[PDB]
Assembly symmetry: C3
Homo-oligomer: 304 residues x 3
Amino acid sequence: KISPELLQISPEVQDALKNKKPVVALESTIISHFPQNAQTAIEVEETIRKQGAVPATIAIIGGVMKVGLSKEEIELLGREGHNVTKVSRRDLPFVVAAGKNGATTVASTMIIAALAGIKVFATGGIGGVHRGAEHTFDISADLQELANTNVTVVCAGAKSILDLGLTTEYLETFGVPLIGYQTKALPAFFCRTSPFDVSIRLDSASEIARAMVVKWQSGLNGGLVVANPIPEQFAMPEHTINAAIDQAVAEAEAQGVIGKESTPFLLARVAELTGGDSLKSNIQLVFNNAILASEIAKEYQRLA
Amino acid sequence: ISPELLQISPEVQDALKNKKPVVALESTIISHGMPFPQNAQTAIEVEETIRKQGAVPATIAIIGGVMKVGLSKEEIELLGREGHNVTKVSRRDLPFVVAAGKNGATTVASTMIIAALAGIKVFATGGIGGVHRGAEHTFDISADLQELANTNVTVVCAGAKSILDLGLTTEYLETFGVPLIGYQTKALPAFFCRTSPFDVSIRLDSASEIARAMVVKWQSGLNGGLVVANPIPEQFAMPEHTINAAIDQAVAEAEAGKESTPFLLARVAELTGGDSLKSNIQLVFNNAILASEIAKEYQRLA
Amino acid sequence: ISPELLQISPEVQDALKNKKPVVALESTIISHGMPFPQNAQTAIEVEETIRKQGAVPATIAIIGGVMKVGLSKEEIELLGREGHNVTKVSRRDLPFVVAAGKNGATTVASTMIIAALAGIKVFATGGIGGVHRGAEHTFDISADLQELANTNVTVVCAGAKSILDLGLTTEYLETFGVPLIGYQTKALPAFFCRTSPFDVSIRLDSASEIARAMVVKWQSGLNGGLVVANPIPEQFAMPEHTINAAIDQAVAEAEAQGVIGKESTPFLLARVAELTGSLKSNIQLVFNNAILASEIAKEYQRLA
Ligand SMILES: [Mn+2]
Ligand SMILES: [Mn+2]
Ligand SMILES: [Mn+2]
């Protein structure tokens, strides 16, 4: 029972949740970080609608945590652009307190989705353990949010700029299911495969939804990662994308890029080295994840 | 929680409702134990041992998708017979085995989880998982440690195997605020061995003192479990110098990933002649006795 | 919670009942800080600083097995006389010291726990524990960081104790979603020094802003504490090079003697003090923190 001053859920989204319609949450750190970003966010939403679900994009607008955004608010974040704060769990109180706009990471989008009672969240890729984290301790707060918050996150696996092995160990220690959708191999984000394997392979949205129900009815708190391979036709060739990522990582280290700036810097550089191709792949994987997320949301509402 | 998800056997139900002391047991001892029909028989004997101590045993497992607190003879027999075909169930595995109606053997973490759902505060096992050697670069860290950080259950064990990294494990437990109690020992015992190069966080000499501390801990709202490291009886114990000699040797030989830990297990086994299974059975009986005592005293004090 | 476990002094009960701002203080600085009578004198002087700021101090300790929130002069003197005979009490120690009827000095972590049990939201200390130098191979990481992750108390400090690894500590706090607020500073102060190569998560210039963010954070269900890093007053600051030399020596030698455990911080601060031969600065940063904490408590109580 949080104050309407802090949190506001759109009329459509309230309506949908009351009527037990499937809702899929979306993050805003994709929209920030124009007027392309806006149009694209709006058609991720329309993709969800065409899959028979209701999209809810989450962001902080004028200090208010908002679940479901008008096209005007979407626009606002789009044009305000890089001036928008990237908001993780530790940033969230300050942006709200100060009455500012903010774009939510995987972690804070999970937080707000859970406040609104939304169990399914579609994104591109989750944060994770950064390469070199054995000596830097640079580990995304996303992984702790997954440890603790009851939301299924549908992604292309963790972002492949990270250390995927360490990320899978970390997920295991903290008891977070890593589900391959129709895959045993952990998808590489831009790529379909990787040297690492998910914790369980499941072939149907129905199985995932049933597992969500069981997990939470049994009081095992925390989220689920659903790793969904990018469609083959949009995947990056392993060698090319690997070279680009490796060079970007090396440059980030050499340039002292650290903290919240690491991921956006890496993604932007990789786009540069691949001539925008990695970006096209990123878009395709996000649509793909929105579709799957919609199916899981439908089956979850059916099973609960 | 739904009876379709979780079922407590009539015996354990009666014990709980009447406030009789209950001790949880894991099921991986049955599936991964001696060849049937011995693994079954043994699990049965551990239960009987708990009853003779004046406690009610609850063996925990997943049978046909149901989390089961306490088992019948035929469930135990079924797990024994299915043997290694039964999957070991961790926290991240639990929902899926249950959803899919599978059988499964519960690990330390999953047994703590299910016990806690049943309101059982004491769990007797052989050993706990820990931080693995090389975890500083592999991040391979047992989920048991996080379960201990979060779930209110006292796990009576022989500590963790010396094949793990015990220094890192003791640090990890301190960071997460988990008591490591030596039972009548300052030295941290490890599996085969009554001692090791590391210390517990506190030594306590009685079941009643451990119970008293559990009561203060949870009445003060400090959630999370407790490790009670109980040295293997001298009769079954192995000298620390030989065990350490063997491990150092096996780790020197391994030097020249996922194969590291069990490689060390097998090698140390070969070198010392130590037998993991037999030793573990001994550990479970011993810990089952201590655990029954702690459960009785806790029941008294709460 | 039973009166047998936890007792709140009349002064503090009065304050809580009448909605007066309360600031918690630790006991470990008392027992393990310096020699008697000076240690007890200083403790009482810190309490008086708080009172002068118009807040009410609550020094916390375990006395005769009881968790005490607010202490008598007699009790502070007891802890001061006993000095190092008094056990340093962490979260994993607390149940056993209470059960055994023992006296004990509470760490940052245990002080947070007991303060929270009493509804006290603001705690002034010298510096927080953190990730130790070499923690990448030793895993020596203060339980203070986990307490900050989980317990709802704002801790006003001069940053982390500076014998620690500040880089690893800042990454750790970020992973676990803990705000690190610089009070009128973006650079993270390092204990004796006003600045360091590292940054806080957000700079805030007023106690009012800090309080408003506390209310928003906890009303939004984001449990966990907040670190407020308050640079030592310029007149008491120590030159980076000199202090860094001493600290360097003390650490290298702590590794030489091989002290690893809870005795590490006491040993370190000891040796460094010796080479300093630092204590003046430590006392003054504590007073400074007590003053800021009093203001934060006033602003927070005003809202709560
Ligand atoms: Mn990071
Ligand atoms: Mn492992
Ligand atoms: Mn330590």
